[PDB]
Paper text:
Chuangxinmycin (CXM) is a promising antimicrobial compound targeting bacterial tryptophanyl-tRNA synthetase (TrpRS), an essential enzyme in protein synthesis. TrpRS catalyzes the ligation of Trp to its cognate tRNA, forming tryptophanyl-tRNA (Trp-tRNA), which is required for the accurate translation of genetic codes into proteins. Importantly, bacterial TrpRS exhibits significant structural and functional differences compared to its mammalian counterpart, making it an attractive target for the development of selective antibiotics. Structurally, CXM is a tryptophan (Trp) mimic but is characterized by a unique dihydrothiopyran heterocycle, which distinguishes it from other known antibiotics and contributes to its distinct physicochemical properties.
To ensure rigorous structural comparative analysis, we also determined the structures of SaTrpRS in the absence of substrates or inhibitors (apo-SaTrpRS) and SaTrpRS in complex with Trp (SaTrpRS/Trp complex) at resolutions of 3.04 Å and 2.32 Å, respectively (ESI†). These structures share a similar three-chain asymmetric unit with the SaTrpRS/CXM complex. The CXM complexes show high conformational similarity to Trp complexes and apo proteins (ESI†).
Numbering used by the authors:
A (entry chain A), B (entry chain A): 1 to 108, 117 to 329
Write the structure that this text describes.
């Protein structure tokens, strides 16, 4: 069984496109891969954060992932800072990185140092679990290139204990787009909020956002990305939130107009966010969330600990006991 | 009671000038200060080290310090990498350091990154114990300046939990110099090894090095640094290894020549290294060394742990439990 590792910025709420595109897939793939879901609070603080806001968003993300259907006895879900291994391994991998290397990543009162020196810590976050696959996008290429390099350097200079990862996503999800700009993916940080639907939107507001999506005035409900990207996008959302093949949706809306369909979808989105958000509050506001992240921290420690100890011995840190 | 923190590179053996100048003092001051002696193996690896050589030199330094008379129930003597707090706190203090800051320190196949990013980790090594005083020399000024700055930044941006240190050495020792160049201090890395006496020299060899010291052909045994620095230096060694006031040595050698005196000192050095080195082997080669460094690690953890946890809470890492 391969091991999957995804780190999760606890900075912003995932959109529903982030649900369709990634989180929903995870809930399958956690039965076919040994998945590590890591809320990277120590990465969070390289960028600016509000001390109080930041400890909150971490529970938010943990609950969001638990609501999505991540199962704590199938994946490991944990907060980075609570696994010391991460910054230990990160330091080792920093001593073999070059300055020029860390500088190049930055290309692809002062400049906070975390913005320069996170790359080795990202590497350590992966390799501690002997991760084979990392589900990330094209702005993360330079990172995985350096993680592969840093594993090669470490296995050559010191003993071979690390595991080069590949960038892979087991079941790719459907490309959701901006509701009021279908040629651009759905970002949680859109200046135009009618462009996205947060998993933590007021359901009614998401409903009105579906209705607000830029589409032609009327049309058939037929998937055509190249020429009718407006309605095509909404059909992707519809299919994604319901598991209805796109040709089945097309079938069910044969001879219906945009209005009938948009109204149905707008009730599906509203329906779904209520099922999600009632799960989400029941986790975010629950004593069992501390129990779960405790279990998920101990899991991730037990694994990463042995990776750090193999690394220390390989470089001559510490003692022999 | 103030708290003293000294980090100890495990890279080279201390000279006897390092004993007179620093280590001997520590054996007093550990009754008047809460002393943390930290063998910085994680600093060791920013520079190049042999994986096998490096884990050895760490026991060497631990034994050297224990032989010197550091007492494990009065100071805390520990290996850095075995206290996770160090790289945890180091990471926090890195996110608030600037790039320009770390770059400036460097002034006072590629450039290993540890050489740029150790400063915050040096800071963390100090502040985790709320250290008031750090016994270091003038090439360490820029470091303590930055540690004071990084504590000020942390106590302003987040809660006030850190303790700015001062550079202080409680009982200064006597300035030993190079045996064959008395105008230059005694370095362990001299290309000319007749210049220094290692605490791990063959005692006879150290004897012959005393005899070899550049002095006038004959003279009175009178302390005169400015004009007879040769014999003056040896008198400093003599006084330092024996606790005989310099005016008492002068007294005891009244009407004796360099030859009588050099011979006496050469037997004192030889005598002393045998008392030391028999202590040193009995530690370096002893099962109790693991017990001692274990006790010294647990001590240092219990203290540093609470400092990291106060820091995490102050920045919003982790959870509230």
């Amino acid at each position: 069984m391969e091991t999957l590792f995804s780190g999760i910025q606890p900075s912003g709420i995932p959109t529903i496109g982030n649900y369709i595109g990634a989180l929903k897939q995870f809930v399958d793939v956690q039965n076919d891969y040994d998945c590590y879901f890591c809320i990277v609070d120590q990465h969070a603080i390289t960028m600016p954060q509000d001390r109080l806001k930041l400890r909150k968003q971490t529970r938010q993300l943990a609950a969001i992932y638990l609501a999505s259907g991540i199962d704590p006895d199938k994946a490991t879900l944990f907060i980075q800072s609570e696994v010391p291994a991460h910054v230990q391994a990160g330091w080792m991998l920093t001593t073999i990185a070059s300055v020029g290397e860390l500088e190049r990543m930055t290309q692809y009162e002062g400049i906070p140092a975390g913005l320069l020196t996170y790359p080795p810590l990202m590497a350590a976050d992966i390799v501690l679990y002997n991760t084979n696959i990392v589900p990330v996008g094209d702005d993360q290429k330079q990172h995985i290139e350096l993680t592969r390099n840093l594993v090669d350097r470490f296995n050559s200079r010191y003993n071979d204990v690390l595991v080069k990862p590949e960038i892979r996503m087991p079941k790719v999800g459907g490309r959701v787009m901006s509701l009021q700009d279908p040629t651009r993916k759905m970002s949680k940080s859109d200046d135009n909020a009618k462009n996205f639907i947060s998993l933590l939107d007021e359901p009614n507001v998401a409903a009105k956002k579906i209705k607000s999506a830029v589409t032609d005035s009327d049309g058939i409900i037929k998937f055509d990305r190249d020429n009718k990207p407006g309605i095509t996008n909404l059909i992707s959302i519809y299919a994604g939130l319901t598991d209805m093949p796109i040709k089945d949706i097309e079938a069910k809306y044969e001879g219906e107009g945009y209005g009938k369909f948009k109204g149905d979808l707008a009730e599906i989105v509203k329906a779904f966010l209520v099922e999600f958000q009632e799960k989400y509050e029941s986790f975010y506001n629950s004593d069992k969330l501390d129990d779960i992240l405790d279990q998920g921290r101990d899991k991730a420690h037990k694994v990463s600990f042995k990776t750090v100890k193999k690394m220390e011995k390989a470089m001559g840190l510490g003692r022999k006991r």
